[PDB]
């Protein structure tokens, strides 16, 4: 699935769950 890291430190979009899941770590630590 595609997801959008529209968060207040990124404003990015990622055409894969693996690419958002691996990136979301950088917004948890």
20 is a contact residue toward Zn ion (CB under 5 A) = no
First to last CA, the chain: 24
Q: Give the C-alpha separation, 11 to 20, whole Å.
A: 12
Nearest to 7 by CA among 21, 25, 27, 29: 27
- State the nearest-atom distance from the C-beta of 7 to Zn ion, in Å: 5
Among 1, 4, 5, 13, binds Zn ion (CB under 5 A): 5
- State the nearest-atom distance from the C-beta of 5 to Zn ion, in Å: 3
- State the nearest-atom distance from the C-beta of 11 to Zn ion, in Å: 8
10 is a contact residue toward Zn ion (CB under 5 A) = yes
């Amino acid at each position: 699935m595609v997801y959008v890291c529209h968060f207040e430190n990124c404003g990015r979009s990622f055409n894969d769950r693996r690419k958002l899941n691996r990136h979301k770590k950088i917004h948890t630590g």
